[PDB]
Ligand binder design. Structure first.
Ligand code: HEM
Ligand code: HEM
Ligand code: HEM
Ligand code: HEM
Lengths: 306, 306, 307, 305, 306, 306
């Protein structure tokens, strides 16, 4: 079988998100790193066995793919599609490589990132760097438990991993990243009950609102998508809080994995463009996307055979 | 193909056992809960990732099944069979629903139980509620390590999960519960060596007694059962100590999972009714069963498709 | 230099509260136990070094004291004073001995309680037994962080330990216990904002409400007491949640330590009888006291020097 | 007098927050200062036994005059800029210091949010650093950092203001400097060369013998004996920080002492050098980008506002 | 279908290595133990659930196999082959039974070893006993991170477990043990850079040296073996530091598992005898092997069916 | 005030006991180390803040003291007094320096011991080296909880630390070490009840036997000593289990601290020589002392001012 990257691994207490573009004539240096990335992961990771839980997921953008590789392309790989809604906008920003680094400790993440960037120095330009941290009982900056309804086990495997529909890239996945900044002043102006109506779940207990009470423009309502078969379309989210108190930055770093970008994009469209019953996702009234990129995260063996 | 409940999950340091009967005209409320139980489990459980280890196993009694569902019944589902032995008696007590809730912390168990009972309020009558706690190095109230010979891996899967013998209910299991109260005064009257002869294992080291020394009326001897094919008949036990010091209650809450109740019942019969070589299980001379109920724990997907 | 009991020790994740009365002619058996209690604590506790954090605080009631001991009495030792307010009542219930047992694990608590009761069997009658457990991020059954404003360090020592004002009992303390049951249905009927106005603190963040917004009948307002010298009167609280889901019991087991019972009683009076600005503590509209007892917890050396 | 948590040990997470007080912001600041310990408990109690949340509040020299009337701490003055032949220790603006520590970053961030929420519109942020533990108590140079910190009574005598200034007993002086390291240059050296810069073995953290230890090594220059012949000591709570993209690999230096003279003597030896050493060799790989001095008063001082 | 021993389990912080020879007429006692070994493992192990991580891997030597069993032999089972190189020698020493005991605590290891030896007393002669301990961030006595490049997941399973090539012993594995003593005085005489050239990896960061800088006589170079198929030949190593400061013993206890001993032996030959480009492994200039034994570790069910 | 060594620190899960004699003309090297010992402790210890709990207590023997220092001697410092009882003998063995190294991890202990011995190499001869480990719930090799009645707080300070009775050495303490080997075969021949009568406490629960049942020749009875004022004379014990399964070594490494050796010696005399009511300590019927040494552990500042 093909061996996937750690795209199915659970949420950790620390994360580093690193997005870079490949400079002119940097292809060679990048290809060398890509073949050594798993090697670097073990080099750092083994030091903190067995509680370290260091992993790195490497993603490659659409434009970057053509510059790096000859032959077949992943069927669903394309640039992030900008969504200009009536009120809210999902922007597309540059990104060739994604490094999604997770561990139970930030030091492990930072050490690995140092090794990666040390090898890439002079071949890449950094676009974005976010240091994520767990906030209390798995909460986001809005004060709600975040990640509850992530699929697990076989359900996760079927939702995330590329299969027979694109057999040359089986074991791969698609990652969509968006950096969100929150308007905390406005958010804290709402009552808890009002906030619950925005999300679609109880704040403290994380219990889902009943279908009779759950608004149609609530986050949970709009991101609940059924396919033609009537089965649920699911994504795996590894969102992390981040921020800077001085600059009044309180953020959610969104990352979602899916076997096809169509699933994530459908959810994006419902959020930004709305449905017949909802103008847009109410969460966006308190959340601004400042980045937006799409990457293909190939199977581990693909990177190694370079 | 069918996804079982957490019937194969290991012992935890905290547990809540909840047994209720369904009131007249409470069927509708119960069916609604049953479809939401896994949802409630995640809602509470996700807060304490990743060390929480919160799980809930839901069981349905024989009489309750007929009230709740139409169509096929699990082949082995029947009311708990009372055993009136010459000396000791295994009583049958009322119970329609079983909630076997486990976590590494009691708060998680209590929180989930609160949500379940909050939804069931006015539709059910509580019969029994036990808060179990780990006692030293996996000991019971008799001071012996308890659970040692539980099957693991494939052996556990084959012993616990319903398979091809009842294909419509594959992935299900049968749970037998008995609340035992111990006569500690009498037990502590025995020497350690005498106690070892009752159980069939060394007290401190938990090493099994050799076959030449192990009495025929010892607990280990009587609960060791070989089937017609010569293979060992096994059950998975999740026993928890409980008690109240003031009321002089020192208890073992027995729960055993098996793919067919015949296995558990055979062991029960040997214990209470005895064999040709043993009058009864010597453990019963220091243990009184005060409850007795049998439940079928269906596959997770069965509950969800309601 | 007198050695106090673990009355200054922090909150743990598990606790057992045990209240018993001494039967007729049980005095001798009780005195023997009291001299061995610290010994039993070590016997169980040492097994779980160093994360066990097993402790037992032993308290003796007013009536019980006279039955047990011959000489001087602690100056502030008296039976719990029942408070019959216009609406709410703080009941006084029987209790001769208090065992406040804490550890990081319930097994340690249960093991010690077993040894104590095994020695006391036939000499005492159990009045109350509560198994307390930590609830999330130090929350009570009302869903609020509970214990925030407990004094620490020197402030705790000055607030809790008997000193020169009663030198024969220096290193002792006074414990007031009340078992509260909560009306969760009524409580969950309120909005979070309304609940915050009852307590006097933000629910999720545990941040105290500003003085301009904090109601006069809020829990925090009424339990804030300044003495004649203008300094704050403080108590050390070791409250634990408890309950049974089936019987719809959601409880707070209140225990407060102070160097004099006057401090705790003042707070009690303000809660139940009210002030000029407040009828009563709004928390009592959702909380019923079902027990009430006062104990003196002597210095460790006092217990050891028996017989 | 009850001191702040200036004697508390190093934690795995820290937030350093330096702000200046805007014109007419004094009132808002004084209100916060009286509530800071209250806010610390509000957040800290949530994580009660593992959390180890603490906040040390420091006040600058210029800020002190704007905030308070009456006596000043004897040693309180603005950070003294040191213009050495080669290296420079810059002085940058800073009125308030918030040194926030915990075993988890969330606790630090939560407390910082509450503090800044109260100070919004009254202060301007100058610096914000999120510190993290790096392996076995290492700094960005790859050396164990904090080994020779005083403990127990020795720490108490070195850090806490006593009878020499009785009105401010239980207080302390904090010097902060944000350092950025030239990792490329540093990693160009052999381990042995690096050891000669620091004055200790890299892996084992064992101090070099006096026969081998260079006179311009970090350990040599920061070893100071007073007129009484006893060692002059400071308590350091240095934390690594950085951003991989911007090539920032930093040490956030913070040192507590009962008098700033001790820290300043060490600073002078580092930047200006001695007769035997031009300067501290560590500075050849380290650039100070901030420099501020604060007085951290006793806890009761803040509360009685 | 066959259940293997814990040969795939990760490194722990404590270990006991026990090598014994079977005395004349001790076969019967040994066979009885072998059938009870898993039983003894559970008896001790269950006490420290779930963080104990107690395991025991039992190995049987070539000569011992013939004395114990009739019928088929594992295809690759033979005595350890002594290697007399020009300079360095890999000695073969006596060993009939191997007990590889691991846990997160030494007490668990010692307790199990006590029970095993208690049963074997008078039937076996101890040859070697080593108490291993974790040294900082997974380091060996040479001060390098040790075990980094161990295979994981499916790769580990394919490298370690006997399969269809010997179907009667599927689920088994081959263990090679060597006790090494290090010349620390000589080693510490080298600069860090010189030490890095001996190993083939950076000392502190554990990052592998680039192929342009990595010497041909470095440890990593010589133990990197590609098969006829062009794929990498891998072994699973569970090396533990040990020693005594007074007697100047600073040791590495080498143990390597592989599906065939040919893999381990190839690496051994390259180390001791060298290649065309390298005289011998430079690590041996600072390391002396004092024991050398080869064992077959059968599937668990093989031991149980005795 | 004088700063003591970590003689009051609690028991840890790992320990190394190191006893050496000073070779001829080794005094200078030893004095240099003694001044650096605290420095070496911090160098290793700080790496594992804050759970490492690394400490080293350095002790100096009577004969060694005269060779190392001029001026005053500790009042109670003398060679270990051999006790030749009717049945059992407490031997005196050579020892000039004691290093009592403790931590929560063995690696820390081993690392520090390496540094100490590295500095002392060629100036000292090792006499004894023991690696101690925690055994279950603070048990010794006899299976009893060991250390229960150790004094704590002020009581410990008054029992252990030299005070005004010898003001020049205030903050110092006296350490007596004895390596005991146990006859486990004989011990396990006794019933639990018989073992309880030997010790004077219940085996499993660690509860002290009542005075009516406690034998006069029990360990607890003989080591209970009251001074002239009727208060108890106490010592602080840091006993650690050790052993080797192959060589049938199951040991207790006894170390006791006291402000004067008279206390420890009184207990020793009662144990070996007996009283009017007891021939000897029954524990000695199952325990053989193979070493015996007495050391003075000076205040920390004494070592530093060298
Ligand atoms: C009265 C309450 C009970 C207590 C305190 C108790 C305790 C124990 C103990 C100490 C052991 C040996 C260690 C172990 O393997 O777990 C054991 C084994 C066992 N018990 Fe029980 N038990 C009780 C009731 C039952 C009941 C009612 C059943 C059957 C329905 C049962 C089935 C077993 C089985 C199958 C074993 C494993 C025997 C073997 O294969 O070696 N137990 N029990
Ligand atoms: C450029 C950033 C700095 C780094 C990376 C750094 C690193 C270190 C290291 C690795 C040590 C040895 C281990 C230890 O005992 O902590 C040390 C010691 C020390 N450092 Fe620094 N340091 C820095 C700046 C400073 C500054 C600005 C001062 C104050 C003027 C200072 C004062 C000290 C002192 C007093 C010692 C202990 C010396 C002794 O008594 O042995 N350091 N530093
Ligand atoms: C003298 C004692 C030995 C020491 C101290 C030692 C140490 C090391 C170290 C530090 C590494 C690099 C990190 C790692 O991947 O584990 C390594 C790699 C390795 N060692 Fe050893 N080793 C020893 C003996 C052996 C022996 C006898 C074998 C085989 C029979 C062996 C096989 C390997 C293999 C296969 C690797 C991985 C190489 C790669 O694929 O990069 N080692 N060893
Ligand atoms: C032969 C090895 C020894 C073993 C296995 C051993 C074991 C024990 C045990 C199980 C206890 C009771 C629990 C406790 O309080 O710690 C105990 C108590 C004690 N032992 Fe030992 N012991 C040994 C040698 C010694 C020696 C040589 C001394 C004195 C020099 C000593 C002094 C004591 C003292 C003072 C107590 C406490 C007595 C009391 O007040 O209850 N032990 N020992």
């Amino acid at each position: 079988e093909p061996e996937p990257q750690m795209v199915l691994s659970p949420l950790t207490s620390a994360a580093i998100f690193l997005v870079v573009t490949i400079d002119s004539g940097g292809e060679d240096t990048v290809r060398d790193l890509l073949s050594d990335v798993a090697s670097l992961e073990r080099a750092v990771g083994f030091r903190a066995q067995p509680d370290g839980r260091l992993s790195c997921v490497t993603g490659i953008g659409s434009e970057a793919w053509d510059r790096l590789f000859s032959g077949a392309r992943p069927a669903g790989l394309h640039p992030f599609r900008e969504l200009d809604g009536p009120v809210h906008r999902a922007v597309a920003t540059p990104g060739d490589l994604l490094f999604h680094i997770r561990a139970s400790r930030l030091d492990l993440c930072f050490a690995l990132a140092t090794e990666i960037m040390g090898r890439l120095r002079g071949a890449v330009t950094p676009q974005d760097e976010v240091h994520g941290f767990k906030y209390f009982d798995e909460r986001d900056m809005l004060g709600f438990v975040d990640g509850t309804e992530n699929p697990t086990g076989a359900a996760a495997r079927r939702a995330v991993l590329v299969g027979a529909e694109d057999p040359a890239f089986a074991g791969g996945s698609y990652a969509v990243v968006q950096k969100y900044l929150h308007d905390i002043d406005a958010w804290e102006g709402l009552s808890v009950e009002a906030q619950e109506r925005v999300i679609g779940r109880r704040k403290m207990t994380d219990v889902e609102l009943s279908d009779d009470v759950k608004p149609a423009d609530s986050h949970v309502a709009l991101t609940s998508v059924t396919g033609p078969d009537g089965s649920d379309l699911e994504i795996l989210r590894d969102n992390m809080p981040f921020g800077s108190v001085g600059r009044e930055e309180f953020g959610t770093y969104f990352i979602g994995y899916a076997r096809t970008p169509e699933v994530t994009e459908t959810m994006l469209e419902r959020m930004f463009l709305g449905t017949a019953s909802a103008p847009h996702d109410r969460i966006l009234d308190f959340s601004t996307a400042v980045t937006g990129s799409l990457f293909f995260t190939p199977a581990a063996d693909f990177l190694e055979d370079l």
